[PDB]
């Protein structure tokens, strides 16, 4: 039942208008200074592989990789920036429908 929630609102951020920053792992050849400053990243794809995979033994893991997807975000990005402004949009969306089901 756990892991029901988390393959909606995995579903619901992957179709998100303000997905695109998140979908896909940061290639660090093309962000100068992502590799230094980002110590564990994290996207969506990576979860969904490992949601497929089986990899996600609770809820609480499963959060954790989506809050560290948004402070990541948070770290790298300015508030103001592009990627900043989507981040918020995603993580906001993401605390709220996690709170409506725990
Ligand atoms: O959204 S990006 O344009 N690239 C996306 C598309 C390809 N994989 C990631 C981007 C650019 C610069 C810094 C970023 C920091 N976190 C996430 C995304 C960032």
């Known amino acids: 039942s756990d892991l029901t ?3 909606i609102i995995l579903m619901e951020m992957e179709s998100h208008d303000a997905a695109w920053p998140f979908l896909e792992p940061v290639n660090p050849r093309l962000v ?3 590799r230094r400053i980002i110590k564990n990243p994290m996207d ?10 089986g ?3 609770s809820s609480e893991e499963f959060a954790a990789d989506a809050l560290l997807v948004f402070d990541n975000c ?3 990005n300015e508030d103001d920036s592009e990627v900043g402004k989507a981040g918020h949009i995603m993580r906001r969306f993401f605390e709220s429908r996690w709170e409506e089901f725990y």
Request: hydrophobic share 25%.
């Open 5 to 7: 929630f988390c393959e």
């Open 44 to 53: 969506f794809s990576t979860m969904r592989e490992r949601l497929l995979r």
């Open 74 to 76: 948070q770290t790298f």
């Open 32 to 34: 100068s200074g992502y």
């Open 55 to 57: 990899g996600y033994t």
